[PDB]
Design a protein around this ligand. Structure first.
Ligand code: LBR
Ligand code: LBR
Ligand code: LBR
Ligand code: BOG
Ligand code: BOG
Ligand code: BOG
Ligand code: D10
Ligand code: D10
Ligand code: D10
Ligand code: D10
Ligand code: D10
Ligand code: D10
Ligand code: D10
Ligand code: D10
Ligand code: D10
Ligand code: D10
Ligand code: D10
Ligand code: D10
Ligand code: D10
Ligand code: D10
Ligand code: D10
Lengths: 189, 189, 189
């Protein structure tokens, strides 16, 4: 792998912590409800939820490093900005989930687009597309399995929120950037 | 004209589509209600609404190209970012229209200002001023004519929402940028 | 002092006006209620509130100029952008104050972080930390004294809103930038 172990671990933990904050926001606003109770929870989430997102974070960062021309100019400042953007957008979906689907989804698309405009490149966008498909698909399957459910005003995409698509896209863009940063910030001559 | 026909057509369509999304958001949140019913509607809007905004988009882009020193460094990335900002702000007004007028209007002014800070120049700002006057004036006239109405908590500017002023301003700034892009993206040596 | 008197006065007034807008937003949304009535009010605020914030604005700008390496490239465009960001974030706290504390506080942290990412440096961040401690501490004392109170869904930090911490932080970052601008914009050869 191109990531060092320690790097993948930090990325995993960063993904996990951000996921717990965002998922807690969804639960406490009634954006989503879990139905699973036999599993251990971490905060408001089943233990495997932060593992999945943390794994996805390190995985997408790794993936970027196998795509052409990882950018060596990427900075901690840019990375902090992208994480903030993704977290900000995530918690915003909790706050507006009960509003009509068009302005809500459009708002999140706007945030995702601006995030890419400021920070993303072609391969970054590609990583975003990959998770923008896989993320919602996994959630649809879990909802279909009765593991959790979305609020009725927030379930238009086969039982899950349409905002998940631009939300995951922005996530993929930033995770890619994070992988670029992991290399770029290594000690230099 | 400085725009090519094909360019003006794309700008017109971009304006029209964004307008339909934003106007639908206003209707479905109860920000506005139409009273006209004898005209054909496109989605939630009278057919002439997207024509007006699309026309205004191409027109403002054209106008910029007659103002001093159109910037040749303008990119698709910048343009996508500005459109996202304008659409994001537009749908946000639908979401917050029922809140008190001061924080709502201030929020939209903030978005408009930041949009200009990131993307606009002097002539861009001038295009913004032009539509920030004309836009709301046209709406005031239409409301006065009983064509549509704003929500009572959102009609303080002679029957229309005070947020229309910074919203149109941001629109004018980005449309100007779009005209700069139309020239800048032409095939080069 | 490094600031000229006229500069400190403009900064003071800018701070005062922005504070009045933000504080009015808090009062009118029920984010906060004043209990003091024997003092003259300016708009929705006791007269000393805008004095305190204006004083804090000029003071933090001054403070930055005693910290290492004030940036001479700082522009009016950057400064307008930062003020807009701080005001936008301020009024947003009024709009979302009744929502659950985690997504609300996280949203404001995100705005503060992005603001620093775009505009701040090390000493700027330090100014932010200084007021992110002092601001909320002063408010806690005033609330303890019964001078005003926060909404029950917005008082988790010893009686004041946890969002005050990232809000003041962003304020400190931008005020620092404003002090840099005051020097940088002086007439040049
Ligand atoms: C090969 C590595 C493992 C691959 C696994 C790829 C799939 C990962 C994602 C889909 C999974 C999560 C399914 C899920 O349970 O989420 C649901 C449960 O109800 C949580 O409910 C929700 O409403 C929240 C949707 C989560 C949105 C995730 C966005 C990621 C942002 C956090 C990272 C920020 C750091 Br750049
Ligand atoms: C010479 C070219 C023709 C000039 C025409 C100039 C005037 C254009 C604008 C004012 C017109 C629209 C009047 C109108 O009907 O709007 C109302 C109807 O109730 C729609 O109601 C609303 O609450 C929405 C206000 C519309 C805000 C428009 C912002 C433009 C953003 C979309 C473009 C984004 C791409 Br950069
Ligand atoms: C040495 C110079 C004087 C130092 C004084 C330092 C302390 C300043 C700040 C803490 C003071 C204000 C205490 C206060 O009364 O505020 C309360 C009263 O209830 C107002 O209530 C609220 O809910 C609003 C909290 C105010 C948030 C202030 C953020 C500043 C943004 C405005 C400036 C933007 C320009 Br960069
Ligand atoms: C992208 C966010 C991850 C950044 C932190 C990764 C931590 C592991 O990264 C390690 O950091 C060490 C200390 O700087 C360096 O000496 C190593 O070269 C580097 O591999
Ligand atoms: C600003 C958004 C408009 C961009 C798309 C304009 C489409 C018409 O633009 C045309 O694009 C062609 C294909 O690239 C070029 O060959 C032409 O030079 C150009 O006029
Ligand atoms: C950071 C916001 C403050 C900017 C305005 C400060 C006004 C006082 O600033 C003064 O401006 C004069 C006119 O430009 C200059 O001639 C002086 O050199 C300058 O001190
Ligand atoms: C070059 C400075 C970049 C700052 C990052 C800001 C992130 C914004 C994401 C929406
Ligand atoms: C720029 C905004 C485009 C996204 C709007 C899509 C609406 C989703 C309908 C389900
Ligand atoms: C290569 C250019 C990719 C741009 C994608 C940004 C759009 C995201 C919207 C959800
Ligand atoms: C400031 C260092 C350059 C690295 C670029 C990363 C994001 C830019 C997107 C155009
Ligand atoms: C960009 C979001 C995509 C939304 C698609 C909705 C599909 C609905 C099928 C029932
Ligand atoms: C140089 C990169 C510019 C990115 C555009 C972002 C648009 C933000 C508008 C508020
Ligand atoms: C920077 C914010 C300035 C705009 C606030 C104006 C309030 C409108 C009152 C009708
Ligand atoms: C020439 C400078 C113009 C700056 C204008 C930006 C402010 C818009 C606020 C609604
Ligand atoms: C990156 C290409 C330069 C074009 C500038 C357009 C917006 C900048 C506003 C200062
Ligand atoms: C920036 C928004 C301007 C608002 C003006 C309000 C005028 C009210 C007249 C009845
Ligand atoms: C170099 C152009 C900087 C534009 C300032 C934007 C401010 C955003 C603060 C969140
Ligand atoms: C990036 C977001 C981190 C901030 C969340 C903190 C929550 C506050 C709980 C009182
Ligand atoms: C020296 C780097 C400082 C970065 C601080 C930005 C984080 C603010 C979050 C509330
Ligand atoms: C464009 C002039 C340079 C001044 C920099 C101020 C903010 C930058 C933060 C990295
Ligand atoms: C970043 C915000 C900090 C919040 C701290 C909450 C402390 C609660 C003590 C009762």
């Amino acid at each position: 792998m191109r990531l060092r172990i320690s790097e993948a671990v930090v990325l995993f933990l960063l993904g996990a912590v951000a996921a717990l904050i965002g998922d807690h926001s969804h639960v406490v606003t009634g954006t989503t409800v879990y139905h699973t109770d036999a599993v251990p929870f971490v905060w408001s989430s089943p233990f495997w939820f932060p593992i999945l997102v943390g794994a996805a974070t390190a995985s997408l960062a790794e993936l970027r490093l196998h795509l052409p021309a990882p950018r060596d100019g990427v900075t901690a400042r840019q990375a902090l900005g992208g994480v903030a953007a993704v977290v900000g957008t995530y918690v915003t979906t909790a706050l507006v989930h009960a509003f009509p689907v068009v302005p809500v989804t459009a708002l999140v698309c706007a945030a995702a687009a601006i995030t890419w405009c400021v920070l993303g490149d072609g391969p970054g966008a590609a990583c975003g597309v990959v998770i923008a498909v896989i993320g919602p698909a996994v959630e649809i399957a879990l909802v279909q399995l009765g593991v959790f459910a979305y609020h009725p005003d927030s379930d238009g995409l086969f039982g899950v929120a349409p905002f998940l698509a631009p939300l995951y896209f922005a996530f993929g863009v930033v995770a890619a950037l994070l992988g670029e940063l992991a290399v770029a910030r290594r000690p230099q001559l």
